[PDB]
């Protein structure tokens, strides 16, 4: 079980720095090269550089030379990526991707495992946790739809799960919309059997990491 676990999302002001971490598990950490790849919202992929945790050897994209710094701590199997003098177009999800080549092999040039990503928003606006409201199943409910409304948060993202991960089928978590207040809003829905409404408990698990919000909202028929 190779796993790469990255640090949580953040908002940083323009001119500030961010240090994104990536903790490796399930393999000898110094044996593989760790790359950093970014993707701006709705955009393609951009390689930033890499560190070889064994010898501290680095390579970097000239486009970030002077702002990017890759380090590692072998005691805690973590690789860091610090990016300085944050500009508005540095808003992106940042991924750590493991090179395939073990023990100095050239296969390091292609990536096998990736972290989940760390969204960094470059903004002078303040962090705000969301409000979570039930989208109650209809009395006139066959299949019934229910969900949760995650209103007024900044910055992105929020994660939403159902029944702690035990409910995945028929789930639709929608892309957030930016409201005129400069705040985000999203809904998460699930279509379930109408017959289950009386018996089965439905709880949405919302997480907004920039504000440390963790809400477990029970969704019931009125």
């Amino acid at each position: 079980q190779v796993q790469l676990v990255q640090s949580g999302a953040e908002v940083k002001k323009p001119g500030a720095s961010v240090k994104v971490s990536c903790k490796a598990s399930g393999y000898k950490f110094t044996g593989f090269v760790m790359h950093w790849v970014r993707q701006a919202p709705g955009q393609g992929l951009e390689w930033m550089g890499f560190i070889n945790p064994y010898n501290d050897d680095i390579q970097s994209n000239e486009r970030f030379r002077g702002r990017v710094t890759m380090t590692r701590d072998t005691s805690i199997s973590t690789a860091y990526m610090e990016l300085s003098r944050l500009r508005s177009d540095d808003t992106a999800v940042y991924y750590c991707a493991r090179g395939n080549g073990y023990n100095f092999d050239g296969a390091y040039r292609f990536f096998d495992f990736w972290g989940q990503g760390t969204m960094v928003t470059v903004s002078s606006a303040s962090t705000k946790g969301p409000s979570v409201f039930p989208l109650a199943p209809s009395s006139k409910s066959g299949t019934a739809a229910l969900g949760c409304l995650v209103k007024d948060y900044f910055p992105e993202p929020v994660t939403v799960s159902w029944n702690s991960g035990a409910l995945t089928s028929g789930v639709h978590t929608f892309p957030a919309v930016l409201q005129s207040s400069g705040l985000y809003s999203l809904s998460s829905v699930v279509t379930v059997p109408s017959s289950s409404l009386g018996t089965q408990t439905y709880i949405c698990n919302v997480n907004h990491k920039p504000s440390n919000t963790k809400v477990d909202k029970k969704v019931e028929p009125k």
Binding site: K28, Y102, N103, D105
Partner: protein
């Protein structure tokens, strides 16, 4: 007598394997054992006759089958790093209480096959000071950086294998002893008379049979797939 295949095997965690065992002695009782340092021989399963099988001390993750009297396969359902051991098959008449053992299967289970490396082999020619001082000539062979520890070193003089004047280390050195995935080094010596080394018609070859991956195994590294192969090094006699 008791036959076993393969002699060596490297597996990836989760893989399946069947160690074959067969005898032509009409023995009713066949058994499987594993041998680990510190521990002695531990019985895994036994069969008191065709169609009958029973659990030994360590049945955990092993299945056995006795469809015929001659064969007794040991199936490894899903290989785990704890199953790394030497396995021996054994057969008793079951009627003389004497037990005979198969040659053994040395098995290594690794989390990743990218840790498998063939040896590099080098021959070191006799020192002139040794030749003059003792009238003897010692050739040294090194097999380095191999994983797993599944190798067979032999010396060949003039196209024929030799055993006289040979000493190969009984166990390899761990290159990084602290590590569990450590690569190995092994040395051997071949000592001949100074005059035998001095004849340029004599050719000495040090051969290392390495057991590694199959030609059907998957491989994503830039380096060559570390398959079962012979790696050798040679030296020619010299009237220097």
């Amino acid at each position: 007598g008791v036959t076993q295949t393969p002699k060596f095997q490297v597996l990836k965690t989760g893989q399946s394997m069947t160690l074959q065992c067969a005898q032509d002695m009409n023995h009713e009782y066949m058994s499987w054992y594993r041998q680990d340092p510190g521990m002695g021989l531990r019985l895994i399963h036994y069969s008191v006759g065709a169609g009958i099988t029973d659990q030994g001390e360590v049945p955990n993750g092993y299945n056995v089958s006795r469809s015929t009297t001659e064969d007794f396969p040991l199936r490894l359902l899903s290989a785990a790093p704890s199953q790394t051991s030497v396995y021996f098959c054994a057969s008793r008449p079951g009627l003389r209480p004497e037990q005979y053992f198969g040659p053994g299967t040395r098995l290594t289970v690794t989390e990743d096959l990218n840790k498998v490396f063939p040896p590099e082999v080098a021959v070191f020619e006799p020192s002139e000071a040794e030749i003059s001082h003792t009238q003897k000539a010692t050739l040294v062979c090194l097999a380095t950086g191999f994983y797993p520890d599944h190798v067979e070193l032999s010396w060949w003089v003039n196209g024929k294998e030799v055993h006289s004047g040979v000493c190969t280390d009984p166990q390899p050195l761990k290159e990084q002893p602290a590590l569990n995935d450590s690569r190995y080094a092994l040395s051997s010596r071949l000592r001949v008379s100074a005059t035998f080394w001095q004849d340029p018609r004599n050719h000495f070859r040090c051969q290392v049979q390495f057991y590694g991956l199959s030609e059907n195994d998957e491989w994503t590294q830039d380096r060559a797939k570390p398959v079962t192969q012979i790696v050798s090094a040679e030296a020619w006699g010299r009237a220097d």
